[PDB]
């Protein structure tokens, strides 16, 4: 598939502790170039060069209906998760 | 939508100084690199300085380094470029401008927002 | 400071024909970005991290290449498309830009 346009996205839930060391959020999608690949990245705050978002859903997608569910796994300290335009401190531990 | 709005810019002495900013909306802004690029008449466009999250790294064109210092203030969303003994080849088209490409090397990284610009006069 | 040659400096073309235009450095690079201006307004992000469109640019557009020579090709030419077009390095610093490439529209 094709990558989403990044400027296309909005939270729907924001991201939360899942209760097993994770986090998981949600967004929603107004483009109509469905469906698409949702483009999700992760860097710790002192090194911005370097992913580190661990996923738990592979190929996260935006189909011809409904959002998107988005769930990974970060290292501990403090972070920053890029989902599209959309961003989101995260401090981990 | 994402929105970068510059100050007034105006004519100085050469050997004097001024202060320019870039007003950021609809972003995060304490979540991006942020930078400055000049576009001079008659030489095309240049690279002056860059910043990271929280300002304690800043990086300059070599032959500016002594005169050019960038600044940022996130809880109030604003960019700073404050400029001393200018000279008349300092004269030039001044762009505020957002930097992406976080989690890739520094090579992939690329200016996916820029400003209005302003314009800054060094003359008598 | 990586010294950047875009050619040609004016490129003519009548509707519906194939283009490219070339960016050659002096020194090796990993990536090329290209940005589109026209007149009375700011720069705009076009390509970037030398093959990937930005956002609203017409798949008529793609970029190429690597090492000291990299391309830029439109593979329909149209009306809106006039303007200028200049290449980016940020492998080496300091990052530098091109002299553009100015795209006419014969009618």
């Known amino acids: 598939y094709s990558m989403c346009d990044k400027t296309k996205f909005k939270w729907k839930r924001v991201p939360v502790d899942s209760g097993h060391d994770t986090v998981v959020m949600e967004v929603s999608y107004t483009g109509s170039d469905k469906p698409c690949r949702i483009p999700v990245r992760a860097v710790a705050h002192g090194v911005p060069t370097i992913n580190v978002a661990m996923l738990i859903t592979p190929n996260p997608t935006i189909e011809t209906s409904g959002g998107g569910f988005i769930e990974m796994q970060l290292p501990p300290g403090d972070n920053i998760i890029y989902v599209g335009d959309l961003s989101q401190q995260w401090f981990q531990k | 939508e994402v929105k970068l709005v510059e100050s007034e810019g105006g004519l100085v002495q050469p050997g004097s100084s001024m202060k320019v900013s870039c007003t950021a909306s609809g972003f995060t802004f304490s979540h991006y690199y942020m930078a400055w690029v000049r576009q001079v008449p008659e030489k095309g466009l240049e690279w002056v300085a860059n910043?990271?999250?929280?300002?304690?790294?800043?990086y300059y064109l070599d032959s500016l380094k002594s005169r050019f210092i960038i600044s940022r203030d996130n809880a109030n969303n604003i960019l700073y470029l404050q400029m001393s003994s200018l000279k008349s080849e300092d004269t030039a088209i001044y762009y505020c401008?957002?930097?992406?490409?976080?989690?890739?090397?520094?090579?992939?990284?690329?200016?996916?927002?820029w400003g209005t610009g302003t314009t800054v006069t060094v003359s008598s | 400071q990586i010294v950047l040659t875009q050619s040609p400096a004016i490129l003519s073309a009548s509707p519906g024909e194939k283009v490219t235009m070339t960016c050659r450095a002096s020194s090796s690079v990993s990536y090329m970005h290209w940005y589109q201006q026209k007149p009375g307004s700011s720069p705009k992000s076009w390509i970037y991290?030398?093959?990937n469109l930005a956002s609203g640019v017409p798949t008529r557009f793609s970029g190429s290449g690597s090492g000291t020579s990299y391309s830029l090709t439109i593979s329909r030419v149209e009306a809106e498309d006039a303007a200028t077009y200049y290449c980016?390095?940020?492998?080496?610093?300091?990052?530098?830009f091109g002299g553009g490439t100015k795209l006419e529209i014969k009618r």
């Open positions: 980016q390095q940020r492998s080496s610093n300091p990052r530098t």
């Open positions: 910043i990271n999250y929280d300002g304690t790294s800043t």
């Open positions: 401008a957002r930097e992406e490409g976080y989690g890739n090397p520094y090579p992939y990284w690329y200016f996916d927002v």
């Open positions: 991290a030398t093959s």
